Design an enzyme around this catalytic site. Structure first.
Site, PDB file in Angstrom:
ATOM      1  N   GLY A  30       0.843  -1.179   0.000  1.00  0.00           N
ATOM      2  CA  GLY A  30       0.000   0.000   0.000  1.00  0.00           C
ATOM      3  C   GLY A  30       0.878   1.229   0.000  1.00  0.00           C
ATOM      4  O   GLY A  30       2.110   1.138  -0.032  1.00  0.00           O
ATOM      5  N   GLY A  32       0.892   5.855   0.898  1.00  0.00           N
ATOM      6  CA  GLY A  32       0.281   7.122   1.263  1.00  0.00           C
ATOM      7  C   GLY A  32       0.853   8.220   0.384  1.00  0.00           C
ATOM      8  O   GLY A  32       1.558   7.923  -0.581  1.00  0.00           O
ATOM      9  N   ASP A 142      -4.698  13.795  10.383  1.00  0.00           N
ATOM     10  CA  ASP A 142      -4.992  13.118   9.120  1.00  0.00           C
ATOM     11  C   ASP A 142      -6.017  12.005   9.335  1.00  0.00           C
ATOM     12  O   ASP A 142      -5.869  10.886   8.843  1.00  0.00           O
ATOM     13  CB  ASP A 142      -3.706  12.589   8.483  1.00  0.00           C
ATOM     14  CG  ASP A 142      -3.805  12.443   6.960  1.00  0.00           C
ATOM     15  OD1 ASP A 142      -4.738  12.991   6.331  1.00  0.00           O
ATOM     16  OD2 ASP A 142      -2.932  11.763   6.388  1.00  0.00           O
TER      17      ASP A 142
HETATM   18  O1  LIG Z   1      -1.022  -3.575   8.404  1.00  0.00           O
HETATM   19  C1  LIG Z   1      -0.704  -2.235   8.428  1.00  0.00           C
HETATM   20  N1  LIG Z   1      -0.068  -1.682   9.411  1.00  0.00           N
HETATM   21  C2  LIG Z   1       0.173  -0.240   9.193  1.00  0.00           C
HETATM   22  C3  LIG Z   1       0.761   0.722   9.909  1.00  0.00           C
HETATM   23  C4  LIG Z   1       0.660   2.072   9.486  1.00  0.00           C
HETATM   24  C5  LIG Z   1       0.097   2.341   8.171  1.00  0.00           C
HETATM   25  C6  LIG Z   1       0.050   3.763   7.691  1.00  0.00           C
HETATM   26  O2  LIG Z   1       0.362   4.649   8.457  1.00  0.00           O
HETATM   27  N2  LIG Z   1      -0.330   4.029   6.358  1.00  0.00           N
HETATM   28  C7  LIG Z   1      -0.407   5.354   5.829  1.00  0.00           C
HETATM   29  C8  LIG Z   1      -1.469   5.372   4.758  1.00  0.00           C
HETATM   30  O3  LIG Z   1      -2.672   5.074   5.417  1.00  0.00           O
HETATM   31  C9  LIG Z   1       0.892   5.797   5.209  1.00  0.00           C
HETATM   32  C10 LIG Z   1       1.671   4.852   4.344  1.00  0.00           C
HETATM   33  C11 LIG Z   1       2.834   5.226   3.787  1.00  0.00           C
HETATM   34  C12 LIG Z   1       3.361   6.611   4.033  1.00  0.00           C
HETATM   35  C13 LIG Z   1       2.653   7.471   4.792  1.00  0.00           C
HETATM   36  C14 LIG Z   1       1.350   7.042   5.415  1.00  0.00           C
HETATM   37  C15 LIG Z   1      -0.425   1.270   7.373  1.00  0.00           C
HETATM   38  C16 LIG Z   1      -0.449   0.026   7.868  1.00  0.00           C
HETATM   39  C17 LIG Z   1      -0.933  -1.236   7.528  1.00  0.00           C
HETATM   40  C18 LIG Z   1      -1.661  -1.450   6.193  1.00  0.00           C
HETATM   41  C19 LIG Z   1      -1.796  -0.327   5.193  1.00  0.00           C
HETATM   42  C20 LIG Z   1      -0.774  -0.024   4.365  1.00  0.00           C
HETATM   43  C21 LIG Z   1      -0.923   1.101   3.377  1.00  0.00           C
HETATM   44  C22 LIG Z   1      -2.071   1.799   3.324  1.00  0.00           C
HETATM   45  C23 LIG Z   1      -3.214   1.455   4.251  1.00  0.00           C
HETATM   46  C24 LIG Z   1      -3.084   0.454   5.138  1.00  0.00           C
HETATM   47  C25 LIG Z   1      -2.387  -2.719   5.788  1.00  0.00           C
HETATM   48  N3  LIG Z   1      -3.013  -2.884   4.585  1.00  0.00           N
HETATM   49  C26 LIG Z   1      -3.547  -4.162   4.556  1.00  0.00           C
HETATM   50  C27 LIG Z   1      -3.245  -4.782   5.747  1.00  0.00           C
HETATM   51  N4  LIG Z   1      -2.524  -3.898   6.504  1.00  0.00           N
END
Ligand SMILES: O=C1Nc2ccc(C(=O)N[C@H](CO)c3ccccc3)cc2/C1=C(\c1ccccc1)c1ncc[nH]1
Length: 293
Positions: A30, A32, A142
């Site tokens: 994923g 951001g 955010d």
């Molecule tokens: O397990 C997961 N543990 C995390 C811990 C923190 C974040 C997070 O902060 N993501 C934001 C966007 O929302 C971001 C990403 C890159 C740069 C700046 C902000 C995401 C996850 C996280 C995600 C995830 C990864 C990318 C976008 C949305 C959900 C996830 N998808 C499916 C299962 N799990």
């Protein structure tokens, strides 16, 4: 300051070393606006983690990269995604996070209707987190469905703290234009000094997401959406006639233009709408099937 000065300063703030020494199987899952997220495995245990990678050179405001790694270090809360460690790798900041196997609320709101038991459950979990954060002077800045993650058993955790801020008695308000345009509070867009109240407005936009499937003005150019949020009356539910008076009344305490009259997180935890909140089990069907709006 130069790029090498900024990198050196951030290096003093993060954990030392290179996490490629203990992580394998980096796969992008994923992203951001500031970077990407990969799944990885801890080599000696098999434990799964999420790794956020942000290039120090590609940030609109690189000093924001200090905020999460300092503010949220060792933070512990039932409804907040855990941060384990942070590192510099080349010109990237890597933040090693808890893996939330249910993914983001965004994929729910785009694929299925949510009933009010489920909407209240999500709102209650987020407000439990926000009430504690706001009491410590932490503003998330955010809040949106992308920032809400789920466990496979339906528990709700707040993530995406890269834009967060700290206020104090000495510096009680921020003035930075920070957030995601469609969710930004009108006083924030107006460049007025603001506090934790901006998170409550953003939560209101996320309620619109959960009811309608998208925030207001979503296919409008972001600068134009921001002008309409700043200048127009608070946005309205597409499906206004489909929601209970309790939900409408709750939303009406969130989308309040005057931040001084907007409800606080602690006030909202008392609202009768949240008495509808289902248990984690009530959320699980949303991850396993789709029901049209
Ligand atoms: O397990 C997961 N543990 C995390 C811990 C923190 C974040 C997070 O902060 N993501 C934001 C966007 O929302 C971001 C990403 C890159 C740069 C700046 C902000 C995401 C996850 C996280 C995600 C995830 C990864 C990318 C976008 C949305 C959900 C996830 N998808 C499916 C299962 N799990």
């Amino acid at each position: 300051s130069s790029h090498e000065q900024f990198r050196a300063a951030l290096q003093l703030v993060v954990d030392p070393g290179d996490p490629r020494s203990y992580l394998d199987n980096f796969i992008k899952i994923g992203e951001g606006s500031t970077g990407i997220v990969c799944i990885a495995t801890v080599r000696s245990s098999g434990k799964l983690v999420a790794v956020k990678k942000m290039d120090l050179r590609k940030q609109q405001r690189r000093e924001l990269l200090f905020n999460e790694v300092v503010i949220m270090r060792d933070y512990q809360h039932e409804n907040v995604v855990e941060m384990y460690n942070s590192y510099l790798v080349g010109d990237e900041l890597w933040v090693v996070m808890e893996f939330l196997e249910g993914g983001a609320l965004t994929d729910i709101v785009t694929h299925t209707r949510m009933n009010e038991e489920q909407i209240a459950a999500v709102c209650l979990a987020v407000l439990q987190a926000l009430s504690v954060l706001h009491a410590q002077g932490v503003i998330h800045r955010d809040i949106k469905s992308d920032s809400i993650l789920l466990t496979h058993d339906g528990r709700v955790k707040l993530s995406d703290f890269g834009f967060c801020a700290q206020v104090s008695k000495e510096v009680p308000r921020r003035k930075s234009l920070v957030g995601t345009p469609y969710w930004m509070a009108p006083e924030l867009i107006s460049r007025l000094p603001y506090g934790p109240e901006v998170d409550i407005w953003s939560l209101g936009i996320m309620v619109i997401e959960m009811v309608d499937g998208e925030p207001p003005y979503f296919n409008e150019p972001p600068l134009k959406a921001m002008k309409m949020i700043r200048d127009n009356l608070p946005p309205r539910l597409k499906n206004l006639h489909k929601v209970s008076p309790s939900l409408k009344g709750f939303l009406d305490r969130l989308l309040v233009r005057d931040p001084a009259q907007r409800a606080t997180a602690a006030e909202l935890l008392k609202h009768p709408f949240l008495a509808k909140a289902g248990p984690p089990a009530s959320i699980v069907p949303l991850m396993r099937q789709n029901r049209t709006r």
